[PDB]
Amino acid sequence: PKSMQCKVILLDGSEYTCDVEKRSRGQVLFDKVCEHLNLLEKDYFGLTYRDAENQKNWLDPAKEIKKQVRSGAWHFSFNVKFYPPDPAQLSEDITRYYLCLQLRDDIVSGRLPCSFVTLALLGSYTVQSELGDYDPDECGSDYISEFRFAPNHTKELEDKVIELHKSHRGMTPAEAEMHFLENAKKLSMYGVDLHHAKDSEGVEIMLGVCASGLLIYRDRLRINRFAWPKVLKISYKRNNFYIKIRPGEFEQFESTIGFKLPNHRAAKRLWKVCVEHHTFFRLL
Numbered sequence: 001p002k003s004m005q006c007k008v009i010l011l012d013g014s015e016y017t018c019d020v021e022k023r024s025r026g027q028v029l030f031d032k033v034c035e036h037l038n039l040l041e042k043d044y045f046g047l048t049y050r051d052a053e054n055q056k057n058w059l060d061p062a063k064e065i066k067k068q069v070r071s072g073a074w075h076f077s078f079n080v081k082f083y084p085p086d087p088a089q090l091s092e093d094i095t096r097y098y099l100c101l102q103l104r105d106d107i108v109s110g111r112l113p114c115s116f117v118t119l120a121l122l123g124s125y126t127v128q129s130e131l132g133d134y135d136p137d138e139c140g141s142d143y144i145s146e147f148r149f150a151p152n153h154t155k156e157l158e159d160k161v162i163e164l165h166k167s168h169r170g171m172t173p174a175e176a177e178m179h180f181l182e183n184a185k186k187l188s189m190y191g192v193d194l195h196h197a198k199d200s201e202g203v204e205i206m207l208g209v210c211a212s213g214l215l216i217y218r219d220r221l222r223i224n225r226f227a228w229p230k231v232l233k234i235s236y237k238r239n240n241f242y243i244k245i246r247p248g249e250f251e252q253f254e255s256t257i258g259f260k261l262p263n264h265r266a267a268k269r270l271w272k273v274c275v276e277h278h279t280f281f282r283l284l
């Protein structure tokens with residue numbers, strides 16, 4: 001029975017290596033990674049791979065790994081797929097811990113924009129969770145943390161992290177992680193997966209996919225939001241992505257909004273993440 005070596009980048013930046021039979025489904029590898037992580041609340045998470053143009057795709061757990069990675073390396077990342085709108089309702093601290101690690105990367109990467117004060121508050125909770133109580137012996141007036149807190153670090157941000165860290169004396173890791181999540185969950189781009197698109201007039205937009213529904217960023221003054229229950233059908237054809245928006249009360253007919261995606265694969269990817277979010281957040 002022939003086995004393929006898999007390498008998975010974990011959310012702490014470390015690499016897990018294992019072997020699966022070459023005709024394995026994605027679920028087989030995912031179960032091995034989750035057992036390694038001592039993760040029970042697995043439904044929120046998934047594995048991603050990078051294709052030819054370094055674009056992220058979700059590894060479908062129900063399909064053969066080889067029919068997804070195709071010509072590419074068996075290299076994956078472990079990621080949050082479905083961001084819980086209320087992380088306090090997760091059953092396990094370790095689930096909230098992995099969600100914190102994902103969100104720290106969301107922040108440092110700039111996928112999750114954040115005010116100065118929120119960057120410093122989130123940073124202060126991470127430090128409290130990881131080092132425990134503030135100690136002056138490690139931090140002088142010229143302290144710079146090993147922790148990456150932001151897309152761009154400043155001495156002012158490092159100072160503010162330390163000032164807030166002093167306020168958290170006696171806070172346990174689980175407690176600090178829950179505070180981190182209570183703040184992060186409120187950010188306007190929390191759990192929003194952004195896709196580049198053009199509207200029916202060729203104007204550049206972004207489509208955001210999240211728990212609450214589909215967001216269309218038209219401009220800074222115009223953001224259209226379609227709650228999942230207002231969405232009846234999602235479809236793709238060639239480079240195009242379509243949603244069927246319910247008739248409001250007393251309307252005879254559904255409305256159709258069409259989008260142009262960069263290519264057919266980008267249309268299919270957007271369709272599948274929308275279907276998965278619609279299903280997941282219909283059941284929560």
Ligand SMILES: Fc1cccnc1NCC1CCOCC1
Nearest residue numbers: 189194204205206217218219220
């Ligand atoms: F409305 C727009 C049209 C075209 C490009 N960008 C747009 N908005 C910028 C934001 C939208 C989501 O948050 C981060 C980027």
